[PDB]
Design a binder for this molecule. Structure first.
Ligand SMILES: Nc1ncnc2c1ncn2[C@@H]1O[C@H](COP(=O)(O)OP(=O)(O)OP(=O)(O)O)[C@@H](O)[C@H]1O
Ligand SMILES: Nc1ncnc2c1ncn2[C@@H]1O[C@H](COP(=O)(O)OP(=O)(O)OP(=O)(O)O)[C@@H](O)[C@H]1O
Ligand SMILES: Nc1ncnc2c1ncn2[C@@H]1O[C@H](COP(=O)(O)OP(=O)(O)OP(=O)(O)O)[C@@H](O)[C@H]1O
Ligand SMILES: Nc1ncnc2c1ncn2[C@@H]1O[C@H](COP(=O)(O)OP(=O)(O)OP(=O)(O)O)[C@@H](O)[C@H]1O
Ligand SMILES: Nc1ncnc2c1ncn2[C@@H]1O[C@H](COP(=O)(O)OP(=O)(O)OP(=O)(O)O)[C@@H](O)[C@H]1O
Ligand SMILES: [Mg+2]
Ligand SMILES: [Mg+2]
Ligand SMILES: [Mg+2]
Ligand SMILES: [Mg+2]
Ligand SMILES: [Mg+2]
Lengths: 354, 110, 351, 51, 278, 260, 141
């Protein structure tokens, strides 16, 4: 094939090419001398190609250097970290707000920070207030903190950095604090942007006064994140969502209003909220006969959203056990009682920010 | 083993000093408070190393002065609390009389 | 041109010779071009990708590059920790559900949550219900928790990732979280898969607020496991079994009804079960046809499955002690005394 | 280079390939001196003490 | 070759476009803190001879500490905005780098660049990242951070009275700081930024509400007089949420009801104290 | 000249093992990671994933498989010089010794008497009693008489500074015990790490409990333990965890009461 | 220490200075290696004010200095806020050979301290430092 020869010939020309060392321009000494620093390496006094612009080589610019002569080939755009890339390109799952029940009050508070200020900036400038930038979703486990984050990421047309705080921790010296810097650098370069940090107590816990070396490295990551949310350089058009079910352990600086402006309490569902969530999860379930959702609600006191889905799941497995293709109210009645027995093994959940 | 006990100032360390003056064996002196370390396992590790030096310099006399100070004094630098001190003691129990064969090491505690 | 193509491919084989320097793709720029980070901790810019289509590369992709020119020679498989790969069982233990006595309800409650969704996925789609996510087996020691896990691995063709709690507790920060998110990554690629976490309380200890010190590293590993059980990305292809002896220690977010949907209480074996257990572990043993396992079950109140098995093991000890080739009911009777481990007493003045 | 002048905790220059000790570099800061720089106790004399 | 002193510095000074928009007048009710910073940072920079004539030894560094939200970082923004001297802004977490030696290296570039561009102000926010009093010699993190702090102490010790460089360090956890950092000659001026008092509260309320379209029916003394121990960030949040409710109701004027709701939401103080104790 | 030096590397993945060009990804400690091919003087079936290998410095081709890495402290735990104490030096423990011997000595000396009868002898003995009652004395007699590998492990030796390190040493301890046909592990003063699990709000003894949880896992977990017959001595058996004091981990509980 | 040419060593127990004391750092008596090399030496610990680590260091140094130290001229100083908080071990006779009290300066002593620190300032002639001393009852130096 003629096209096959072209692909093989393009391969041969590719083989002759050589990789180029990636660095960063520190200062332009002369019209032909530059000071650059390798990404993880020493600093060199290098030259530059004559064909290069040499005005785009401002200090801090990422550059590619020859392996032998270390001369600058080209200026590269700001590097996006592979971990930060996975944060932006993280599939929420196409979650709609119609899949969240009883959190209409809490949804509106969340959208008042991340939706309206990013679309109508002049509305808030008119009153004389800078819109809140950070929001904390806290509550007992299973109440819908991550689901609300997925719904916001799925529905809101904005740049979104989704990350779990335990997934940023790296054993290398200064890597975890570097990842936070890259997260906000990506957000600053892609305004408007939203950073959702799930399980913030992984790195955002209270700073220890007598901790270990591992703790100190995490606290440096925390206070690096603190410096980005509210520090010397003002964060513009970057909103932050933080979710945790143990906000009592968080640092006071993290919970300070200047950083986490709104503390939205995703509480356990009430009688109406439990009814809403039950219909959400029992909807797709095949059933004959009248289903008294109020009867299940009355025995669902103390349940979260996860239990109400388990009640729907267990009721189906009762039907599977009886070789039934449908679920009756009696199947739900055992399921809600069975789940209620499992709630005795769960310890205290009422934890609030201090 | 031998332990010297009594009211303060009664001559417990003095007799050990007299022992160290007229001994042909290596004399190792460690105050009991020196076995409280700032890190977990270091206290047990130190008791293990102290009798390891005693093994090398056989015959030897190990003087654990103020042995009671390891438990009667609580220091915030000791990460593990009374539980780490107990593990330090359990290492000390093995060294005095344990599985490993003990050479010519005589232990004096005060 | 055929000779030119074949001669061209010969020149590739010289440059494509091993060893390759393992690297990770960092970026894919346009002015078609790639940035890679070598395992020697070096960041390089490649004006041309190499011998791999730029469309088939994504950030974080493991690639093997030329040791000298650092040009991407091939794509590499996804990288999983050797510790995570070493906890995937390949021997597939030879246990059976008939080797477990007195746990029929517990076996049913686990099989219909771990095995039924994998095989009969239609029973859940027609009913419109989501299959249970996570099964926790809790109870007193010796009640047969990891035994059922072995039987689960025995009677299942799915990938099984046996694991213990202390294995996820690592010195370096983020190492344990990497293992947790690598076990689920490896399990996802080998779906259907079952992940068994024995001694869950090693990592699942409840979080707490402290001002001086605490085990935040393990709480970070647990928080990673919470995300893998139920987090931002819903993983509905890896079944998770967990076992613990003290469920009161476990963090409430771990015992959630989305992470561990079914919490099975393993009870102390009752009189019928204890006789069944002693019968289970006496099959390979020359036992005389007069042993009243009903009487032994009555003589072993507050015995777990391990003690009931130990009764059979100690019974052969006494038979060998007296040189018998057959075990008698008396050998079982005072083999109960050994397992009972009652302290020596001169209580002959009673009655 | 005299072996008697090679004292412990001395700075020395070693050749590139053979690593041969060929020069006794000026001694580094005394660890006690370095310890007292970070503590930085103000120097005092009897003239600056009153009462 | 010998390179120019301003060259080879991974940390750059503040450009004119990077100067924060925060004024001194933007800050409300910090006269004690404003005076001490002025007397210890910006006045010695311009009146070094008047200090020498009087006999005062100017403080080489200033430590700003207090509860979070009490105006530490913002005063540095105001100082950087209102200064004729160079400003080098940094946070201690950046010093900890993967490449061993790059931390202590980039510490001395900050001080070398500041020395070459004198008068200059070095601001190191979140100093606890590299100034913790505990160090584990078997961990590379604490071994490297120990090098960073030792270089930081060495650099400040290496400044005589002639070099016109002032260092500002800010932390809300000064209890965790190494005592060697607070020795004379390194940080001789410790300024506390406490929770605002009642008089401080009404100045913070007045300065933030001055930029907001309030109604004449709003009496700020109702919320100032409350016994809640709140910070400037709390007061900013109260006013910020007050305009949030006005925006929600498609309004541009904040009435008293918005302030009442915003105050209740922002504070949200659980009682945490039982009446039988008093 | 003839014997080149070999760099220690760990195999991570074998690519296309079925074909005639099997490619091995190796992790050369702190140096780098290389995709290499196997040397022609070793068999393809001799290299498995996750196993340490020896590689040359030029093409990094795997030249020799290597034993699994064991902590030097764990390696020093095995007894090399047996004690000078026999069972004749233990008095008043006649019943105690026979129970001790028939679990820890008889199965290894005469294994034929148990396989024929389908008997699985107990793989664990707990010696408990007041101090001075002969708990370590009997274990010293066991090590003197035993012919298998004997490993003495003091519980305070398993307490380590870092998180998860104590459980690591338990893993490598049983890993190295499994490299022997028959082995004996002695856990003197197991109350150092064998304490019962609890929740005191703070993380009280959480790290040490994990070491105990690892020891429990190796004794009786998903994987078979092996031919290891463990032996623990403690003067505070009331403090031990119920899971550790369960048959299958400590099958025999031999009490060293004060002599009659 | 300045007037006697004795090397002054401040022992704060800081882990920042442990790399200079010694890589071991298992005992505070590892300081004696660098103290002997600089004899005469004065080891000074100040109690800023669990049990006190400065007091614990004092005991360990005093035990070695009792009769187990070969080199002489190694003196040890402790500074404390109060003497009744001291351990019974340090308060035991024979351990601390002299206890020196530093009462807050009275009216005359405050004048001397005032006369000392005011020299470093450009003072107008005729300052009544006596009156300022009277204006500061119960003040420290
Ligand atoms: N309000 C709700 N409406 C509908 N489903 C809900 C609701 N709250 C929770 N759920 C269900 O609960 C399950 C888990 O909830 P989610 O992942 O949001 O937990 P969470 O609040 O983040 O808890 P955790 O504290 O464990 O992180 C999901 O399957 C979701 O459908
Ligand atoms: N019986 C004695 N004969 C002579 N001198 C004695 C006698 N008892 C005590 N002393 C003197 O007392 C000094 C201090 O006592 P010493 O250090 O021996 O105390 P101790 O018994 O070890 O007690 P402790 O450590 O509890 O304070 C000794 O240096 C010695 O000179
Ligand atoms: N119900 C049972 N039927 C049969 N055998 C049983 C039963 N329960 C326990 N056993 C036996 O107990 C021995 C060990 O028990 P296993 O470790 O499986 O239980 P576990 O509850 O998971 O233990 P642990 O709580 O200590 O982790 C096995 O040999 C197994 O055969
Ligand atoms: N006196 C004040 N007047 C006006 N606003 C104030 C005042 N004090 C604090 N603030 C508010 O504080 C917020 C930022 O807090 P700032 O960074 O100054 O505090 P900090 O002490 O440095 O914080 P942290 O210790 O958490 O790092 C601003 O939004 C500002 O409105
Ligand atoms: N039954 C015995 N027969 C002979 N000598 C004995 C006996 N029991 C103890 N001894 C002697 O007493 C000493 C006590 O040490 P041993 O190691 O036996 O104590 P232990 O029971 O392990 O104590 P601890 O619980 O404190 O560790 C032995 O070294 C031995 O010399
Ligand atoms: Mg969640
Ligand atoms: Mg004494
Ligand atoms: Mg088990
Ligand atoms: Mg700040
Ligand atoms: Mg013993």
């Amino acid at each position: 094939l003629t096209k096959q020869y072209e692909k093989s010939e393009n391969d041969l020309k590719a083989l002759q090419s050589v990789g180029q060392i990636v660095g960063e321009v520190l200062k332009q000494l002369t019209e032909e001398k530059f000071i650059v620093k390798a990404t993880n390496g020493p600093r060199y006094v290098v030259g530059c190609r004559r064909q290069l612009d040499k005005s785009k080589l401002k200090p801090g610019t990422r550059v590619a250097l020859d392996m032998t002569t270390l001369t600058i080939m080209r200026y590269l755009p700001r590097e996006v970290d592979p971990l930060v890339y996975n944060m932006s390109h993280e599939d929420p799952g196409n979650v709609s707000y119609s899949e969240i029940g009883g959190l209409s009050e809490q949804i509106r508070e969340l959208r008042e920070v991340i939706e309206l200020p990013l679309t109508n900036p002049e509305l808030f400038q008119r009153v004389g207030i800078i819109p809140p930038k950070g929001c904390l979703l806290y509550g007992p486990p299973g109440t819908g903190k991550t689901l609300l984050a997925r719904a916001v990421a799925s529905q809101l047309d904005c740049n979104f950095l989704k990350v779990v705080s335990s997934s940023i921790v790296d054993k290398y010296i200064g890597e975890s604090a570097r990842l936070i810097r890259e997260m906000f650098n990506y957000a600053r370069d892609h305004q408007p942007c939203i950073i959702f940090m799930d399980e913030i107590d992984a790195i955002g816990g209270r700073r220890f006064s007598e901790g270990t070396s591992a703790d100190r490295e995490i606290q440096r990551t925390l206070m690096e994140l603190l410096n980005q949310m509210d520090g010397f350089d003002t964060l513009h058009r970057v909103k932050m969502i933080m979710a945790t079910n143990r906000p009592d352990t968080l640092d006071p600086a993290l919970l300070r209003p200047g950083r986490l402006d709104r503390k939205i309490h995703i509480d356990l569902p009430n009688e109406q909220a439990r009814l809403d969530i039950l219909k959400i999860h029992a909807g797709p379930i095949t059933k004959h006969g009248e289903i008294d959702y109020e009867a299940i609600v009355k025995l669902s006191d103390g349940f979260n959203g996860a239990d109400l889905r388990n009640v729907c799941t267990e009721a189906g497995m009762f039907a599977i056990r009886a070789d039934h293709d449908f679920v009756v109210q009696e199947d739900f009645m055992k399921a809600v009682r069975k789940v209620a027995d499992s709630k005795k093994l769960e310890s205290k959940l009422d934890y609030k920010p201090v | 083993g031998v332990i010297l006990y009594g009211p303060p100032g009664t001559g417990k360390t003095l007799l050990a000093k007299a022992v160290a003056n007229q001994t042909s064996a290596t004399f190792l002196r460690v105050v009991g408070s020196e076995l409280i370390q700032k890190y977990l396992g270091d206290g047990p590790k130190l008791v293990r190393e102290l009798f390891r030096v005693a093994e090398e310099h056989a015959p030897s006399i190990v003087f654990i002065d103020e042995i009671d100070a390891i438990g009667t004094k609580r220091y915030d630098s000791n990460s593990g609390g009374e539980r780490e001190i107990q593990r330090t003691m359990l290492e000390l129990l093995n060294q005095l009389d344990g599985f490993d064969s003990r050479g010519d090491v005589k232990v004096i505690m005060a | 041109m055929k000779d030119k193509i074949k001669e061209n491919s010969e020149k590739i084989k010289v440059n494509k010779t091993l060893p390759y320097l393992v690297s990770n793709v960092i970026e894919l720029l346009d002015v078609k071009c790639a940035v890679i980070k070598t395992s020697t901790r070096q960041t390089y810019f490649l004006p041309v990708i190499g011998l791999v289509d730029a469309e088939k590369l994504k950030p974080g992709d493991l690639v093997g590059v030329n040791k000298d020119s650092y040009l991407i020679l091939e794509t590499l498989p996804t990288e999983y920790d050797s510790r995570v790969k070493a906890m995937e069982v390949d021997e597939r233990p030879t246990e059976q559900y008939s080797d477990i006595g007195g746990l029929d309800k517990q076996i049913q409650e686990l099989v219909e949550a771990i095995v039924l969704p994998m095989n009969h996925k239609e029973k859940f789609e027609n009913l419109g219900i989501q299959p249970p996510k996570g099964v926790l087996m809790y109870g007193p020691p010796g009640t047969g928790k990891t035994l059922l896990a072995r039987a689960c691995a025995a009677q299942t063709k799915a990938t099984f990732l046996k694991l213990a709690g202390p294995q996820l507790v690592q010195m370096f920060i983020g190492d344990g979280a990497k293992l947790v998110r690598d076990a689920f990554a490896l399990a996802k690629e080998k779906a259907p898969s079952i992940i068994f976490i024995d001694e869950l309380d090693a990592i699942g200890t409840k979080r707490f607020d402290s001002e001086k010190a605490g085990d935040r590293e393990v709480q970070r590993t647990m928080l990673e496991l919470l995300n893998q059980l139920d987090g931002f990305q819903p993983n509905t292809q890896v079944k998770v079994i967990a076992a613990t002896n003290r469920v009161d220690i476990l963090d409430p977010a771990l015992l959630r009804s989305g992470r561990l949907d079914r919490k099975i209480e393993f009870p102390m074996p009752n009189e019928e079960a204890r006789a069944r257990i002693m019968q289970i572990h006496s099959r390979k043993m020359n036992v005389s046809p007069d042993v009243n396992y009903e009487e032994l079950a009555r003589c072993t109140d507050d015995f777990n499955g391990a003690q009931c098995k130990a009764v059979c093991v100690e019974a052969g000890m006494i038979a060998l002690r007296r040189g018998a080739t057959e075990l008698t009911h008396e050998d079982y009777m005072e083999g109960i005394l050994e397992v009972q481990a009652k302290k020596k007493a001169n209580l002959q003045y009673y009655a | 280079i005299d072996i008697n002048d090679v004292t412990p905790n001395c700075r020395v220059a070693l050749r590139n390939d053979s690593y041969t000790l060929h020069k006794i570099l000026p001694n580094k800061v005394d660890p006690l001196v370095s310890l007292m720089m970070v503590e930085k106790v103000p120097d005092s004399t009897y003239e600056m003490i009153g009462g | 070759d010998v390179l120019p002193p301003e060259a080879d510095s991974s940390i750059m000074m503040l450009t004119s476009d990077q100067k924060p928009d925060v004024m001194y007048a933007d800050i409300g009710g910090m006269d004690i803190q404003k005076q001490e910073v002025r007397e210890a940072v910006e006045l010695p920079l311009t009146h070094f001879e008047l200090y020498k004539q009087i006999g005062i030894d100017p403080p080489r560094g200033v430590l700003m500490y207090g509860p979070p939200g009490c105006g530490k970082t913002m005063l540095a923004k105001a100082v950087a905005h209102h200064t004729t001297a160079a400003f080098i802004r940094v946070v201690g977490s950046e010093f900890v780098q993967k490449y061993l030696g790059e931390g202590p290296r980039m510490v001395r570039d900050v001080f070398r660049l500041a020395k070459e561009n004198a008068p200059a102000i070095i601001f190191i926010d979140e100093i606890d990242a590299i100034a913790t009093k505990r160090f584990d010699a078997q961990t590379g993190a604490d071994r490297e951070v120990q090098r960073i702090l030792l270089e930081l102490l060495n650099q400040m010790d290496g400044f005589d009275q002639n070099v016109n460089v002032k260092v500002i360090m800010a932390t809300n956890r000064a209890d965790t700081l190494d005592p060697a950092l607070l020795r004379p000659g390194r940080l001789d001026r410790k300024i506390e930024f406490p929770l605002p008092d009642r008089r401080q509260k009404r100045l913070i309320f007045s300065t933030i509400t001055s930029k907001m379209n309030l109604s004449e029916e709003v009496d700020l003394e109702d919320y100032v007089a409350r016994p809640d121990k709140i910070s400037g960030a709390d007061i900013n949040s109260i006013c910020q949420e007050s305009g949030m409710l006005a925006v929600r109701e498609n309004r541009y004027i904040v009435l008293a009801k918005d302030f009442e709701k915003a105050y209740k939401t922002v504070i949200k103080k659980d009682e945490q104290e039982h009446e039988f104790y008093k | 000249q003839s014997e080149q030096p070999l760099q220690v590397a760990r195999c991570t993945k074998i690519i296309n093992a079925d074909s005639e060009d099997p490619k091995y990804i190796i992790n050369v400690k702190q140096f780098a990671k290389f995709v290499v091919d196997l040397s022609d003087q070793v068999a393809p079936t001799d290299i498995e994933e996750g196993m340490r290998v020896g590689v040359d410095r030029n093409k990094y081709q795997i030249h020799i498989p290597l034993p699994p890495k064991i902590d030097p402290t764990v390696t020093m735990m095995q007894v090399e010089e047996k004690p000078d104490v026999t069972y004749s030096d233990v008095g008043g423990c006649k019943e105690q010794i026979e129970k001790l011997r028939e679990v820890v000595e008889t199965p290894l000396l005469h294994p034929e008497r148990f396989v024929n009868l389908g008997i699985e002898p107990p793989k664990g003995v707990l010696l408990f009693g007041p101090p001075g009652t002969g708990k370590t004395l009997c274990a010293r007699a066991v090590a003197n008489r035993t012919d298998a590998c004997f490993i003495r492990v003091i519980g305070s030796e398993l307490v380590q500074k870092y998180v998860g390190e104590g459980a690591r040493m338990v893993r490598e301890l049983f890993e190295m015990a499994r490299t022997k046909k028959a082995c004996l592990i002695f856990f003197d003063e197991i109350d150092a790490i064998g304490g019962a699990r609890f929740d005191d709000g703070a993380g009280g003894d959480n790290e040490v409990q994990r070491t105990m949880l690892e020891l429990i896992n190796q004794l009786d977990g998903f994987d078979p333990r092996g031919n290891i017959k463990v032996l623990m001595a403690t003067n505070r058996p009331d403090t031990l965890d119920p899971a550790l004091m369960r048959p299958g981990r400590l099958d025999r509980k031999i009490e060293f009461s004060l002599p009659d | 220490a300045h007037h006697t040419d004795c090397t002054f060593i401040r022992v704060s127990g800081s882990e920042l200075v442990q790399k200079f004391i010694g890589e071991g750092a298992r005992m505070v008596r590892e300081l004696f290696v660098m103290a002997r090399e600089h004899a005469p030496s004065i080891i000074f610990m100040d109690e800023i004010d669990g049990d006190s680590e400065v007091q614990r260091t004092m005991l360990e140094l005093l035990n070695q200095l009792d009769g187990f130290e070969a080199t002489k001229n190694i003196k040890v100083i402790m500074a404390t806020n109060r003497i009744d908080i001291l351990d019974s071990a340090l308060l035991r006779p024979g351990r601390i050979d002299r206890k020196i009290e530093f009462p807050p300066p009275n009216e005359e002593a405050r004048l001397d301290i005032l006369k000392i620190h005011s020299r470093k300032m450009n003072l107008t002639r005729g300052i009544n430092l006596r009156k300022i001393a009277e204006l500061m009852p119960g003040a420290s130096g």
